[model samples]
Target: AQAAGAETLPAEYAGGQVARGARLGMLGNADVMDAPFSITSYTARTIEQQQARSVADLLQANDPSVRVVGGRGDLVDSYTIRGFSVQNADVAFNGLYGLLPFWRVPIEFAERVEVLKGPNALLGGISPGGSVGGTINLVPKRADDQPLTRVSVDWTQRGQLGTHLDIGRRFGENNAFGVRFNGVYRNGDTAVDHQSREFPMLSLGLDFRGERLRLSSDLLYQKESLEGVVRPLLTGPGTTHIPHAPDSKTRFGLRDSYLDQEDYSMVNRGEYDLADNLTAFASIGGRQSNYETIAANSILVGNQGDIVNSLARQRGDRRTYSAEVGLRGNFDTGPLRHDWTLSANRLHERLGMVYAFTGMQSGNLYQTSPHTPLPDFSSLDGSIPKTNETDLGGVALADRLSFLEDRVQVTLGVRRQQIESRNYDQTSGARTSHDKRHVWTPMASVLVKPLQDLSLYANYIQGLSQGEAAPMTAANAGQVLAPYKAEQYEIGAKYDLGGFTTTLALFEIRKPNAYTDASNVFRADGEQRNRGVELSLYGEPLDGVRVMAGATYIKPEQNKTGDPASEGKDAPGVARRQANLGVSWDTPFVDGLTLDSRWIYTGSAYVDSANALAVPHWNRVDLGAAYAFQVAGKPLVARANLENALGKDYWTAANGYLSISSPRTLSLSLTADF
Candidate 1:
């Protein structure tokens, strides 16, 4: 909320920006870089360069330890950080959580993305499914003295169009008031027929600084359609090896199912400088979201003749409201600094989902007549959807201390959370409710900077997920149970070598009891572990040339017994070896022109538990160029990207269970800056 520090830097050096891993945010790390925990940071400049559409895509395209989960588009854009699948409810902006809405966040408004490559148990409640992989902190841009305005238009394959605008203004002699706005609109059809989406977002922020205090507020509204639905390209085996034909038919299998959502959020932050070495601050925020989706694909179970019936079309809808508040202060003791934080938050959520079976009827039979229509699958099964409401509250605190001219830093924290839920059935007219469950998590990390350009660190943290209602027959009540805990451990090293930077890390995550059931119920008896290594390189390799490259090696395993469907199977869609390479250079003869090329590689991986075969390996290349110039003293840039430049047919996601991917494509972009 307040300026990081008044220290000035070289004009073109891009310093003085509020940084992470320090005392700036509600949490602080003495030696974020050298802390035993692994972390990766993406700056605003990089985010802007990528022109990301949602938080998920940004991480998948840039972060070394992260990957996309489920399918493409907003509805299933949830992320997996270091093998831990991040739930939709875990994504946050600034200090507040965002509800799932039609329009999710477009990366255009993000100032930076911070990846804590291990457990953040000290900072937020964890997900029971798996919390060991780490957390991602999304930071929004703040208003500064510099004025900026940029508008961009982009066109993509499959008739996708995107428009984005960013503007910032500073007024008053002391620059006491500064404002920034980000807006985006995107609409398009996918490679899959009948699948399309429209989404947009607007974020406004204001900042004011005084001698003794600083205040800031941010508001965001995002809405987008869930046009992308679950369509299995290759189901039940050997999909990765299937060559993707040049035509769309070979690349996708889609249905008419859709998910529509709406989301809104507001956040406020306050900071006061009680003394030169001490500061206090608070954050308050609220969010609301609603989601509705339908299922289309159904499995046909058979033995001798055939069951012949299809799993009925399913429907799910959820509405959630949440708010949180925090207070923190910091002071320095000689060369060492100490900081502490306390927070309280609450959330209310209602979820409803219905499942039934079709009586030997065709799922693709759509109603063509407006006057008379066939009965939907639900009418035959006599099963109605059930609704569940959840309420949650938590209190937490943490302390950080630094020593030896900031060469070493340590952190300690814990949190206590309470959860309550009520479930009711529509057809059975049955209800159940519970409250007063307690969950606790702990955190600790140490960082060391023994040399000017080198950092080494390690960390261990524990996180617990809030318990929730379980959908089960009364006979299985005791077997369903509550939420469980997950833990993480990491070690890493980083080097900033002037023109280039490099990092390497090793990590392991263990969740004692995860969530598992016949129909995706919320329960225990699920245990899993993920272990991995990450390596990255970035910066100018030579004068007039830039480079970015990284790779990940991971293995995920389930330890729980009797769940052969998921146990010991590679986490769906995660390749054991994944890598990216990019190289760009300025045109020697054309002053305003530049060219760039990139390659991404994903190693073959097992998609099914039987492990009879593997998803095929994939390699893709992209090439593009841009020209920039000054028109009437205004900066203008035009670029065109030829994706799948070599037109390599490939699939990046294919496990034994399903296969899905995008075909070779291209895009063009134009931007004007003021």
Candidate 2:
């Protein structure tokens, strides 16, 4: 480990091949062996190796605890981590929130994708979207001391083609100034028949280092569009049996339908030395997003591909601003070592929306052609004039104490958080409803290490999320609910043996469920309890073999519910068991050749609160090959990957809606350093 500003940075693992550690929010960079929480940091190397198209794809492959639950061909990046949903808007970028795209953020700009499981209100403040399952943080790429310039071209099955360019440089005396730039453009048909995608992104990073100050800034712009995207299927009230999945490549939506999104964002952060052992840091960032979407909502398909659809058009503009400032220092009091941090953060966002719904339409899921016009049901209402605004602010103070020559560590922290939201009538520009709440959240953890490479830990943490508002159609329309709190308890152990590290954790989380009561009032109902066990093993197990594998088992139940039938039922969408195993090996016979493979399995889940519709389990296999060689004295790498190699057609999700598996896909890419 080496010093990077006020934290310990890992240039690479012991072999200088894999990322050794990652930033731990207010705690600074922590080695996986020392972290008290369950954390996994995927390096840029892993991203390139997998040729990940987006954040969802990367997490699906590496993290067993995460499930990518977006509808087939859905442009939005949605996921459920540890049996709870995590909104794309809630993901953090470089430890700051409200900066990433509200829809989806591509992976080309990331240096590290860090996943911290469980509630994190004290670690990073309550997520604006109120996600308690887990937190995903993207660390922007920074220019390294070594100059780099790499270019790549890639192609996927069904004619998609793309190119990527990455460049980094450092200048000035003592390499104190640096810049890194990345850009990608890809357009073409996708694996799904008749579906096409167009995406373009660019990111630039600048940083400066001096004797007492370190500063860094990032700028990002991305535009993405989807055509002929398939939507999720919802079972009609009368339907008793869940439909079987169609052919993997089948297209249920017309070719003329599309969804488009554009995002622009900028963030800047800095740290200054107040004393040799103390540092002050601040960060500010903002984002603007524009979206246009037309979809067949609440689609219902029959066992034979018969379908009923309700169409809708939605256009939105969202603006967000966020900032955080903190002080961190280390000192000794009496016979113990102490590390303390004090921080304050604020986030504000406003959303402008105009939506129109078309009446129920008739369509066949098996339609093999385009040009099916959607039947109109209701008048289009682009002038409804509705707006939503939210503001969140919090202050946190934390301290970590060490004893027994730093073998034992104890951490305690608390955050005072306040949330306010307002809904206004855009037509009259008059406030219609408002809600406000303030709460104190606490965190405590203990870590003990009896061996140099082993550690045991436990933690209790709580998370806060914005409460749901009563729908206008409900008896209590326009009523805002107070913020909700989710609590978690976890215990875990970690062991490291030279090149390999393994972890085991058991955790339980409970969050209040909201529903309409017998009195016709929308309110916080019963609670949802999610309990799970997770096992992860990563790193090189042999001289030429690398493996990243994990498994998760969860039992999520609606312990309390407004309806008697819903009580004691399994939470929709969350599978009982999910596992991922990946292996990569350098071929002994071929000096520059490597082979890789991965397996993913998901267990059964219920489609509704009654648990009458049970979806069966399913799995997929992926295979990959790569060769590194020299071309004109320049290093070149070629890669080929096959996804869903077995070509199984199955229902992949039975949560909020029904989703089918993606078709088999083939991809190839070549990269060279110049």
Candidate 3:
């Protein structure tokens, strides 16, 4: 599979170091100098070296366009990308949707983490949840020619311990068959007081490579549980003021709260060469997730940090299936060369949920609460039979035309996306609302390379999102609206200086919003516009030194609001400026020793629609050191990391809700390769 073939798979670019480029959607893999969009692909070496526990941790340090919203102490993983929310369940697996583990993705078996900085409905179809901020794809690891066996042990602050094992081998005559397995386990208390977790994950991958055909299959299972689950804080509507952030190590949620999840999935993919210049590919996958949680309805905090809260219990089941088929070819006609692809994909998901809430209780932010009785779930006993289901599919055609001896390239494409959703009554088990629609999303892009190391590009695209369902409190309850549309325009330039790359881009997006009308009908009656400029720099600039840094300045505004006073106000929860910088150096004076440091900053943001409340800016710093050596002919590596070195006490966000920054934490790990 590593050799050049009909469809050469993408791999790390720096011989075994950090990757310099990534997958370019249906256009396949591309070098940083040739790609037309802002993209990044983190290699497995980077993941292991950092000792990252989840995808959010890696992105917070490496990607500036992303920000980890609240949920630091909770089971869910939430993020803000390009000033828009992206749910963890919406992430893609091997370029296919609805196939990875739900809620959170384990890093135990991922080979590459790829990110595309904007909407790509035409290239990858509308996201299942319609996230326009960006898209993330996880690529599974494959066995290499050389056998591998690696093991690691690690520990986090407050006594958490973990172990990871990775093994791979290639068999058969010509190494036509390959197998890889990875497993991980972790248990104990976390940084937050009294918060404890137990997690286990295992995955297996198998592949076969032939003269004209390649096939691969993967299976994964993971179970995670939290005994003292932390929940976000919520203030009463009348008290519009945000209270001071509590101590970094303190937890506000009840000690008896819990959350548990189990995930299992399997995927199969195959590719065949049709001719010297053409290839065909197909993939199919399915996933099932079961979740259980006992949490607070909301910690209704007062202006003085006192709280009135109630408990809630919920159980959910989710099942998903997805498939894709495509053909890609390269051909030439007269003076123009064409790289084209024709593809189609489908994804369906069904979700079942049951929940109940208990009566309110008295508590305080700084004090412990007495044990309370569990909620009586007898009222929510049924399976809840398919509370929500979605059916989505799309067909797309794209062609890249090269002109002037391949110096100038233009890409044009369109996708016909069909969206459908249904809602059912919890008690009756009958469909209560439904919506279906078909829309065409088009894309146009141009790239001009005046010099071998410099490229300029422009892109125009549209994004699609599932329609909103009217809440039961509204007069038009259970009504389903048509799908919403978002339009974007962007231009960028890139420069590759052999060892490092720099890119700058300017972009704008306009999207429709929904609100209840005067007569109580939920309708698309609002508008939002987000405009921004981004600058990024990455790669090694000097010997034994590497750097990754970027910054974004965005202006997000509510162009049209239901309330006259809120019109043209800055959107809540999104900062106007965000930046991150990370640097690593292998000291020349000391062999097998390296040091790294990072900085993150976010500007002030509004907390309400009327722009009356504002949260101040905040910043954090982290540092680490590592050493690699050989002991008795076996490779060994040790690392130590300190996050929030200064222990900055500040509020990270205060939009509709509030969240405090994480406290200082220390972690240590050791790895041995045998």
lDDT, residue 396, model 1: 83
TM-score for each predicted model, relative to the true structure:
0.82, 0.96, 0.96
The TM-score, computed over Cα atoms with residue i paired to residue i, of candidate 3 is 0.96
Instruction: State the lDDT of candidate 3 residue by residue for 398-489, as single tens digits.
Output: 88888997689999998899998887877788888888999999899899999988999998887788878887767887776778888888
- Per-residue lDDT for 248-351 in model 1, tens only? 22312224456666667667776676665555656666565555554334221221211111223455555555566666666777886776677776666666
True-vs-predicted CA distance for residue 75, candidate 2, Å: 1.2
The residue pairs in collision within model 3 are: none
Which of the two candidates, 1 or 2, achieves a greater lDDT against the reference?
2
Give the total clashing residue pairs for model 1.
16
Q: Every model's Cα RMSD, please?
A: 5.5, 2.3, 2.1
lDDT, candidate 2, 99-198, per-residue tens: 9988776888888887889888988888878898888888888998999999999999898899999999999999999999999999999898888889
C-alpha-based local distance difference test score of model 1: 0.60
TM-score, candidate 2, is 0.96
- Model 3, total clashes: 0
In model 1, state the lDDT of residue 174. Answer: 90
